[model samples]
Target chain A: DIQMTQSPASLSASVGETVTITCRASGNIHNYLAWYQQKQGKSPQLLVYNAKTLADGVPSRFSGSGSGTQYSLKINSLQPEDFGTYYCHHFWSTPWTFGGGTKLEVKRADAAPTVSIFPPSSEQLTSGGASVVCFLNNFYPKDINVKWKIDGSERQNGVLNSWTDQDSKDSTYSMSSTLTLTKDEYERHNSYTCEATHKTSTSPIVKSFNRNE
Target chain B: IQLVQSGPELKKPGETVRISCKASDYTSGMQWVQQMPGKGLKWIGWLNTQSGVPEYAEDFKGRFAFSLETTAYLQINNLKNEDTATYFCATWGGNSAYWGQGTTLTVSSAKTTPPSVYPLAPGTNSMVTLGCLVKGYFPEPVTVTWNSGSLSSGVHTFPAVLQSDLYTLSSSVTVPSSTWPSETVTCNVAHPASSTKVDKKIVPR
Candidate 1:
């Protein structure tokens, strides 16, 4: 009787990072080991058969290494679609068992957003107090926060302040916080600041608001 | 997105040629056109790039095929000299259409062929004009001679004419009906391209 085993039942990796999945056979597989990938709802796709030779049409990044009982499947410069369940198989034995389940989860490491603060547009003026817009673009993980502080105190008034999150086309995220101040409140507050934070870090991105410029 | 035409192709008659028009975005359909040498434009067909369905013009229906995939393709089989032409693939784009530089297909024979000789029964009451016909030769140059010039009343050999890329011609010899069944008259022909010769003896039935 023969058997196959894999390490780390599941793994976590991010885009552009490389990861390796290892397979060990109880008996010598001679070079008759193979690797396959299976998505959530699809049949398994053969990646490396005959131990190290890739199947037809498979991308070059998915490669097989090692020989005999110890074998590894390494993906170089991981892509988004590379996140899937992998299976290691050994055919040297007549029973021929397909084993090993190393699930890979693709996550973004971290990216701080590019910040912008636009001065109040005059077109929205006259009808209303000058409206200010603070923007956050190209952030990873889609988990972000925006805050407006007046004189070092956080403002929670919805009547003249709000913000929203935007999912961009390039898989990154963007967010904007629109804050409006009453004419009296604008002049009364000598200092106003915007603070932004992402899920990746505890540090906050802070910027001051200039009333004149 | 831009479109790229397949490379140029050269083949002889009785062969097949398949050309392609690959696009950056394969979703858009393609219109393929044919322009023969010194001839007007001919519509080959269109490819339903999304659905993989193809539509061809009546003149191009036979021995012609249009297929689709990551790119659209035009395949022509049972080739002939008349099919020697440049093929263009035009595609629809979101802004300003895209087209290919055109793939030129040249179809010609490396080796020429000599015509096959046949006897045409020319029965006349007074004088019988026994005729020999040659057909299915390439490059249209043939020399036909009748061996019975001395006893022949009138000997005439027509110039070779084109029959859709091949040449065909006829030679005739007239002899009195009184001695028409006396003997057979030999007709000789030669082809320069293939270095072939033919002889046909006309015997009245």
Candidate 2:
């Protein structure tokens, strides 16, 4: 097992500024390095795999290069959505290992996310009970939380909370959470609510839904 | 950050299995890995946790899929012998690296194997005692009977002991020594897994 060390624990840059994150493996990684961009509260996205090959659909702005134990992930003209923790990963002959993360904070204008909730889709309703989604978009600072409730009771299970956006714009971000209900449970319950909170907000942005509506 | 994994599973071939990983704090990408019996780890695929798209390795292209919501999941359809292994879901490139405890899938044929019956040496008994042993039976509910059913005052069959995956048991019968000289005793075994009945015959031997 090789130890991975990443430099410059954190960095803050404006949009269009280029930043590079570097890593050193305790032993040789043999050009098996991969780079990842992990946004807050979401799964990390693979940007560069196989040392330098960009993963399919990854933006051209991101690139990776390395040999032996040294590796680097460079972003050219960083986009707002590119703000994330970056890490170098390698598993050539050892177990999956990752470097210490580089937190890239893109300095941007403060904004509050707009929150909303949607009823279960027809497909979902027909298949089984159904699932309702709470959505939030255009948020800054990245720190946020969303909780689900049914009939004034908090739901801690059977909730699929996730960042569901495919892309970002307005130098902001978006995320969503879903609540699945069994057929019988749906019939027995009503008045679902989702509360979204951001670090910059004084009060939580909330959305509610009634089965009759 | 840490990852929570699903529990171990035992399934028959041709069945389906779904293993999931829950991260205390998720990263950008979730990856699924496979480790077969006594074999090294193989990358099954990686999923985009944000967009919820999965890309699998060439060898895992057919029956494997990666899905995600709050957590990452690996679902295999129409499981095969090769699918018997520990499945892992890991998050790479985060504040720190994290992986699940690993969900093991044991895919095997669900068929019963007949017991191998052997005559036991119970030559010295208070009365005339006959014993029979059954070994190496799978999916057991085997019945051991004595053909001298009427003569035996006492017939005892020990509970089956599951030694590993197979079962073993012993059955003995006690009868009057006066009736044992010419009495032919037969130990009959009935097993659903075996087509032919198994019996060990003892005639004053």
Candidate 3:
């Protein structure tokens, strides 16, 4: 199996700056490397594959290069939305491998709220009555609401806690809501949703987690 | 079709952690990923579900071992605090949709061993190779660099190799002989285990 040596585990830069992250494969990967971008608390999206080929709908500003053992991902004119984690994966060999990840953060610290849910583990799923937590972080203005829904029905058995980092230069705020349910609710294997709403936005950031996922 | 994994584990440093993923189909196409708190997912390498052959990511090379026994089991010896993360085993083989429920492991402490560079040796004709080896390290990602007197030409580096014990890695770089005989060659190694770079300078006899 080939090993990918990724560098600059994390970096901070300004918008419009060109950022380059690299991965060095231990063996010849034959340009089978791929690059993926993962926003905070979200699934990874493919940016570039087969070394230099961009995936569908990926902006041309994101490019990949290198052959054999060396590979890289370059983001030109970095955007505010580009502040997240980037990973390099090799599909050349069976049982593919991925880099640790390069988090491209913004030096100026401007951003929107990121949402994520912590689902029950397999054991908790089988045993029943697991508590799920929804996290919303890195947003400004300090006003946000996270609501819980099970099987399409709104559930009010949620506890919300929030804290604002006013002491820091960036006054981003974070909030979380926990939903506790019994085994029967999860055994239904139905859809669970966390809707986060802010005062400035009409549409809520709705994130769902399925029993299977 | 389904990959079911073991329960989460909490251990102390110097302990061993073993988690298994049993698949409903052939295990040959399984792979693992690590998700640390407040971080993105990291691919740990593929597990040849059928053959039990495991390929590791750069950081997962040492102390982390993968094997097959009716399923795939990932074992980390001498666990460290950094090893406290959730592991997910998923299928490759053109099937990216199947993933096992992750098993989260928490360790109280850990240790790291800086890599040692072997002496520089002459390669075929105009080629010279320098080797670096690291052992008993935890957490997978590592970096290696080769520097000499000039940058007129490029260097070739081999992938880091994992030994049977799981945490020992061996990698080497080959450069043009003409550039290194008069130039002082240095191989630099870095990983999360160490705060400073492990640099080795080699002068050929």
Candidate 4:
């Protein structure tokens, strides 16, 4: 019997906040996975299928990932109307199994963190080490996860977690994370992403800085 | 833009039923989905509506056939009662996103006699054994209850058996040896759509 285990069974977020939920399968599903959103008394709507392909008309903020036995669905900049139960289903096994479901609830904050990316300067790209900075400011409830990726592949090292500080006036928080790269890594035509996930967002705020050939 | 399916069907065991779905435009592929009354949706596989090549799920390999000329048709031969369910044909351009109105299929057959209750051999350890035999019921889901006045405490067992169109169900219960002579045990069997029930009682012989 194939089993799908989903986590964070339920979460609460303000409009414009981001949340990520994950599902682990007992066996490899070969990416034949789909994420569905089911609102109260309504049939489920497909959000993403084949791991990461968004269904038609789905918002850009809804994304998925994972291969083998692990998968995740992330919602960014959540809307007030997005509060509902979400399920992850595996099509690779008979009597396909669905994750237990993750319910997204609404919080009152109602504002997203301002996010921006600063790419490596020409001087930094030429000599040796290249680096990028991701700035997240004026976000409430300081809990956030930031990630960096080069050309769609996650960059684990040289990527810092959010360093939080409070604004003097409004009590809102500001944070930044930086990713460093070698000359060879930055010289190749590559796209770097700064993804910021906050309690006030429904999905990760992603900014891509692309280097052209 | 869409696929329109045929109306519902009523068939018996050994009878054949054909269901068709007409699409608004030529599609790259089409697939069928099955939904039993209260069950979740099940994918039955994709049909190359353009080339007539078919792919079926593991459980749908035999007795289920598909055909496509201008439209698509699904034919089930020697259908069993368990085949009763609603089916939808989904057409796809790239994502296979369009679905048709579902067609419900019902299979009816001659009713099998009600279950019979009898006392089995007394266990070597002096335990009392009773059995209820309900056979040849269509569409499987039948409820069986064992009752002995207020003495509802007993062991229950259901052994699996197969039939052509219906299912054969047998349940046995065991109780203390002393209770058999003083109380009469009744076995009642019922199906969802039918209000009529068949019950039998046994005492000693």
User: What are the RMSD figures for all models against the true structure?
Assistant: 36.7, 27.7, 27.4, 27.4
- Computed on C-alphas against the true complex, the DockQ of each candidate is 0.01, 0.01, 0.05, 0.01
Q: Name the runs in model 2 displaced over 4 angstroms.
A: A7-12, A16-20, A27-106, A121-128, A165-168, B1-205
Classify candidate 2 by CAPRI docking class.
incorrect
Docking class of 1: incorrect
Q: TM-scores for chain B, in order?
A: 0.52, 0.54, 0.49, 0.52
Number of the top candidate by DockQ? 3
Poorly placed runs, candidate 4 (over 4 Å) = A1-30, A36-45, A75-213, B110-205
What is the TM-score, restricted to chain A, for candidate 1?
0.52
Model 1 misplaced stretches (Cα beyond 4 Å): A109-213, B1-205
For model 2, state the Cα shift of residue A6 in Å: 2.6
Q: Write the number of the candidate with greater lDDT, choosing between 3 and 4.
A: 4
RMSD of 4: 27.4
Please tell me the interface RMSD, in Å, for model 3.
24.9
The window of 10 residues in a row where model 2 chain B has the poorest summed lDDT is B120-129
- The lDDT ranking, best first, is 2, 4, 1, 3
Best by TM-score: 4
